[PDB]
Homo-oligomer: A and B are copies of this chain.
């Protein structure tokens, strides 16, 4: 029945109107500067990059989504075998469901069976930390899929509107996370869930030892909208209130700038609303080390293995086109390519004290 929520999440995300609903990534305010003399050939473009101790083929990851029941495992299986084929990292959805129910384990474990080489990323929610999870649950989440890192998700906006939500984010949870990180043999990434990471949140996590961030900004999947729908469906009055919050959060573009600026040495996944290899290029150019995606991967996976393979060819082709067209022979060159920032993202950055000169230098 946490199982039911897992199913409902997929169903609404895949089939209802929640992608970018009343929200915006601010990526339209980011322009990559065209170079009519690139100085390179398309074929020499190198998209290889580091993901902790592994090498990955493309600076893109699939971020965590699902697991909990056997038809969710079959979706995981499809994503995983394509991810493995393409050499891209994959996170799984929250594994709480499997900690609570042993029959749910196999829908996660299937990932590692079919993708023995790529980084795989475990997932647990911050609220479970204030509610009694500790080391053991972490190591269990990790060994279940022989994970290379574990993501801990921030979802307070979701929890607030979720019919059976748990909005508990007491400071003690970070004391615990920091102790646990002592004992883990893989790194921790803190990721959001559609509402983005701000400078204050980034600096607070950093002060507890967190070095790896996944922006999951607003503009992509709208998790407040998903829970709103689940509220309409139950006739739960929170639904009209969630409607007033549909545009709540830090936009992806702004969150990439905020995290890069306030924690210049972070390893940074720029995600929330990444829908094309152009978006992924902008995310990286702006300051991310890698671009994350979830929803469009889900929708293709549902359509099948070949649809998902095609989706990835397309993303990769687009990313490379953007590198071609900015004269960027590799990922490091894209991270320093010339951009223009306009409109509302410019005004956000200015109001937040983001000095563009030092910004430019920090993103590189």
Query: Contact residues of A with B, CB < 8 Å?
Result: 31-42, 126, 130, 154-157, 160-161, 167-171, 174, 190, 192-193, 195-198, 200-201, 204-205, 237-238, 240-241, 244-245, 248-250, 276-278, 310, 313-314, 317-318, 321, 324-325, 327, 338, 340-344, 346-348, 351-352, 356
Bound-state CA distance A89–B216 (Å) is: 40
Give the docked Cα–Cα distance between A40 and B170 (Å). 4
Interface centre among A238, A250, A325 (most CB of B within 10 A): A325
Judging by beta carbons under 8 Å apart, are A37 and B126 in contact?
yes
Residues of B within 8 A of A35 (CB): 156, 198, 200-201
Question: Which of B41, B204, B314 is close to A237, meaning CB atoms less than 8 Å apart?
Answer: B314
Contact of A347 among B126, B168, B190, B342 (CB under 8 A): B342
Question: Which B residues are CB-close (under 8 A) to A192?
Answer: 36
Report the nearest B residue to A192, measured CB to CB.
B36
A195's contact among B36, B193, B351, by CB below 8 Å, is which?
Answer: B36
Across the interface, which residues of B come within 8 angstroms of A276, CB to CB? 241, 244
Select from chain B the residue with minimum beta-carbon distance to A31: B348
Chain B residues near A249: list those with CB within 8 A.
34
A-B CB contact pairs (8 Å), 28 listed: A32-B248, A34-B157, A34-B196, A35-B198, A35-B200, A36-B196, A36-B198, A37-B156, A37-B169, A37-B201, A37-B205, A39-B170, A40-B169, A40-B171, A42-B167, A156-B325, A157-B325, A160-B324, A160-B325, A198-B338, A200-B338, A237-B314, A241-B276, A244-B276, A244-B277, A245-B325, A342-B347, A342-B351
Known: A241-B318, A348-B342. A39 touches B171 (CB 8 A): yes
Distance, CA A278 to CA B347, complexed state (A): 22
A interface SS class:
mixed
> Is A160 in contact with B321, judged by CB distance below 8 angstroms?
yes
Residues of B within 8 A of A39 (CB): 169-171, 204
| Chain B residues within an 8 Å CB radius of A310 | 237
Are B198 and A34 in touch, CB under 8 angstroms? yes
Q: Which residue of B lies closest to A172 (CB)?
A: B39
Q: Which of A35, A42, A155, A240 has the most CB of B within 10 A?
A: A35
Residues of B within 8 A of A245 (CB): 278, 318, 321, 325
Q: How far is the CB of A156 from chain B (nearest CB, A)?
A: 5
Given A130-B41, A343-B347, A347-B343, residue A248 in contact with residue B34 (CB < 8 A):
yes
- Please give the distance in Å from A239's CB to the nearest CB on chain B: 10
Check A200–B318 contact: CB distance below 8 A: no
Are the C-beta atoms of B34 and A241 separated by less than 8 Å?
A: no
| CB-based nearest B residue for A351 | B340
Chain B residue nearest in CB terms to A278: B244
- Once A200-B327, A340-B351, A348-B340 are accepted as A-B contacts, the answer to whether A321 and B241 lie under 8 Å apart by CB is yes
With A314-B241, A347-B343 known as contacts, the answer to whether A154 contacts B278 (CB < 8 A) is no
Contact for A201 among B36, B168, B190, CB less than 8 A: B36
For the complex of A and B, list the 7 residue pairs with the smallest distance between their C-beta atoms, beginning with the closest: A36-B154, A42-B167, A38-B169, A244-B276, A34-B249, A41-B168, A36-B192
Which of A41, A170, A237 has the largest number of chain B CB atoms within 10 A? Answer: A41
Q: Is the CB of B160 within 8 A of A248?
A: no
A126–B168 CA distance with the chains assembled, in angstroms: 49
How many angstroms between the C-alpha atoms of A245 and B37 in the bound complex?
17
